[PDB]
Amino acid sequence: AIRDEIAKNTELSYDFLPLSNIKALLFFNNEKETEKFALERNWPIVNSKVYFNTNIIEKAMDYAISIEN
């Protein structure tokens, strides 16, 4: 219940982590539990290092038809 939080935190925190740092955050004693979790989190992983990621005419007529009702 906590870890997702940090995860759900860190997703928006910053896009870029070394794997050792993910272990540091999520309180793992293991390196592989990490990418276990990240896959479970769908996190694309690069070699220890993870990444977390109507025309105007129309608009005009829309404003009009909204006005003349």
One-letter amino acid at 44 equals: P
Interface positions with another protein (CB under 8 A):
55-65, 67-69
12, 44 in Cβ contact below 8 A?
Answer: no
Looking at beta carbons only, is 12 or 56 nearer to another protein?
56
Q: Is the backbone of residue 28 left (phi > 0), alpha (psi -120 to 50) or beta?
A: beta
How many C-beta neighbours within 10 Å does residue 19 have? Answer: 18
Nearest distance from residue 60's CB to another protein, in Å? 4
Nearest distance from residue 47's CB to another protein, in Å? 38
Nearest distance from residue 3's CB to another protein, in Å? 50
One-letter amino acid at 26 equals: L
Looking at beta carbons only, is 51 or 63 nearer to another protein?
63
